[PDB]
Amino acid sequence: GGSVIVIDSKAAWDAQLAKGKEEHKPIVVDFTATWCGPCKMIAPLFETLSNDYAGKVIFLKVDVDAVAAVAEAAGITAMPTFHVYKDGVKADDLVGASQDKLKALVAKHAAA
Numbered sequence: 001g002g003s004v005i006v007i008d009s010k011a012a013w014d015a016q017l018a019k020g021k022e023e024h025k026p027i028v029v030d031f032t033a034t035w036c037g038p039c040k041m042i043a044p045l046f047e048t049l050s051n052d053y054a055g056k057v058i059f060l061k062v063d064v065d066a067v068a069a070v071a072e073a074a075g076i077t078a079m080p081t082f083h084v085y086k087d088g089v090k091a092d093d094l095v096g097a098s099q100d101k102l103k104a105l106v107a108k109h110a111a112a
Helices: 010-019 039-052 068-074 099-110
Strands: 027-032 058-063 081-084 092-095
Touching (some): 010 068, 027 039, 027 099, 039 099, 081 099, 092 099
Antiparallel strands (some): 027 081, 081 092
16 A cells, blocks of 8 residues: 655545555654755655655655654654664664665565
8 A cells, every 4th residue: 555645644645544454554753844855856866766656665765854743753863864664663774865775675675
């Protein structure tokens, strides 16, 4: 259930996590924020992968600016911070923009 949308609430994160049918697929969350300039570009960049890897891969663009609690609990610091909760648990991570590495991880965890 590729919820390839942007979100700003813990409740909606939970909802998506569930309806996403996470069981066997990559929950790729981009914990990004508004104010952190580059973040605003990194989001639409990742949106490309979101569009492409539809249905299976869940691209959660989480607005850390809003969902501060989940972000700090998850362990976000240097936003944007990408985590891959494949199946239903943080299987891999990637900090910063790091587009190539992000692409590589999405590909890796998607083709699995």
